[PDB]
Amino acid sequence: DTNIVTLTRFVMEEGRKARGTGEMTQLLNSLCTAVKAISTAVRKAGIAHLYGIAGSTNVTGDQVKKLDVLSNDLVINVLKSSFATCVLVSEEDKNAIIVEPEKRGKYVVCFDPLDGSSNIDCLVSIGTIFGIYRKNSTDEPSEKDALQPGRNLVAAGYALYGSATMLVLAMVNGVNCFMLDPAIGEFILVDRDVKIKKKGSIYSINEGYAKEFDPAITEYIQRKKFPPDNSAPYGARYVGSMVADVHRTLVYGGIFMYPANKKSPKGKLRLLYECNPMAYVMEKAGGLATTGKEAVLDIVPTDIHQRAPIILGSPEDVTELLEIYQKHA
Numbered sequence: 442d443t444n445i446v447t448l449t450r451f452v453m454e455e456g457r458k459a460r461g462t463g464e465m466t467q468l469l470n471s472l473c474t475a476v477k478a479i480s481t482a483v484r485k486a487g488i489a490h491l492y493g494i495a496g497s498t499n500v501t502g503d504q505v506k507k508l509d510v511l512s513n514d515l516v517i518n519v520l521k522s523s524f525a526t527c528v529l530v531s532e533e534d535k536n537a538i539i540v541e542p543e544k545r546g547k548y549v550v551c552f553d554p555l556d557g558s559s560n561i562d563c564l565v566s567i568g569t570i571f572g573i574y575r576k577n578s579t580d581e582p583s584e585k586d587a588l589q590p591g592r593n594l595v596a597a598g599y600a601l602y603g604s605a606t607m608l609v610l611a612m613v614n615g616v617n618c619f620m621l622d623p624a625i626g627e628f629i630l631v632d633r634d635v636k637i638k639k640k641g642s643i644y645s646i647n648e649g650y651a652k653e654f655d656p657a658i659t660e661y662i663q664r665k666k667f668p669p670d671n672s673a674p675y676g677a678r679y680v681g682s683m684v685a686d687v688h689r690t691l692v693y694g695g696i697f698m699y700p701a702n703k704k705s706p707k708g709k710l711r712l713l714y715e716c717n718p719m720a721y722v723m724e725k726a727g728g729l730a731t732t733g734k735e736a737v738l739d740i741v742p743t744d745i746h747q748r749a750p751i752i753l754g755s756p757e758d759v760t761e762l763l764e765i766y767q768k769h770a
């Protein structure tokens with residue numbers, strides 16, 4: 442009751458040995474504030490008339506929902522005022538943001554201020570996704586600072602605005618979940634050092650693209666429905682919000698897929714602020730994340746809005762699909 446283990450404390454205590462400036466704690470503290478404000482807005486969006494659109498095609502293309510504008514604004518201002526960042530990349534901005542000299546810190550943050558657009562109006566779970574890099578150049582901060590492989594990630598995670606609000610945070614030693622206590626406006630640790638199961642029993646994909654699927658994906662789904670060894674067929678789940686589907690994959694095991702298809706060679710999801718953060722999380726929890734041909738975290742991007750196919754979850758499920766891709770190649 443009286444010794445509340447918050448995100449702040451846990452992080453602080455974490456690297457109490459790896460000393461450091463602590464701008465990471467400032468950074469994460471800042472992010473938490475934006476997440477709380479988004480959570481509150483989302484929980485009353487129909488009352489606050491925050492459903493519907495802002496109107497406009499996003500980066501490569503996307504409608505802008507009002508909550509999208511709001512959430513983007515919040516995350517950018519808090520990151521800026523944290524004094525811990527120098528370059529910001531957001532799904533909503535064509536170019537990377539360069540923070541003014543007086544507020545610069547050493548971290549680069551890629552984020553999705555609000556992911557799961559198609560699910561906003563029907564009240565399904567939506568979320569916020571982020572990845573944080575240390576700046577490694579020495580020259581003036583620039584968009585190039587964001588074009589790093591996910592492998593260089595120092596911290597990544599997401600806020601899930603589901604039946605409860607959860608902040609899932611991955612760093613070099615592992616994954617931990619923090620749940621928002623709406624009463625005191627704190628993120629409290631509820632799951633420590635989370636590890637994904639080796640094999641799950643759920644598969645998650647939009648089968649409405651069956652006509653555009655590659656034969657590897659096709660064969661894999663067929664094997665989930667009609668197991669060659671007479672084992673029970675997998676259950677299917679597709680919430681439609683990547684944060685919800687991936688979070689369930691994390692805690693129940695199984696696999697999540699947004700693969701390349703006949704119309705999308707690089708898939709749909711964005712590498713920098715959608716695929717890489719989730720890959721990292723998944724990798725720190727003992728899972729895998731591939732395009733079907735290579736590790737997502739090993740891709741060196743050339744576009745901050747670059748797309749990538751992604752398959753992730755329990756290692757033995759992901760490895761089974763990879764085997765099918767390797768067979769078809």
Ligand SMILES: O=P(O)(O)OC[C@H]1O[C@](O)(CO)[C@@H](O)[C@@H]1O
Pocket residue numbers: 556557558559647681682683684709
């Ligand atoms: O409607 P589709 O093509 O299945 O897209 C769903 C995906 O799109 C997203 O909203 C991101 O654009 C993800 O949250 C979700 O995984």
Ligand SMILES: [Mg+2]
Pocket residue numbers: 509532553554555556557558
């Ligand atoms: Mg978005």
Ligand SMILES: [Tl+]
Pocket residue numbers: 499503504505509532533558
């Ligand atoms: Tl968007």
Ligand SMILES: [Tl+]
Pocket residue numbers: 506509555556557558559
């Ligand atoms: Tl959105």
Ligand SMILES: [Tl+]
Pocket residue numbers: 709710711715
């Ligand atoms: Tl996307």
Ligand SMILES: [Tl+]
Pocket residue numbers: 503532711
């Ligand atoms: Tl997007």
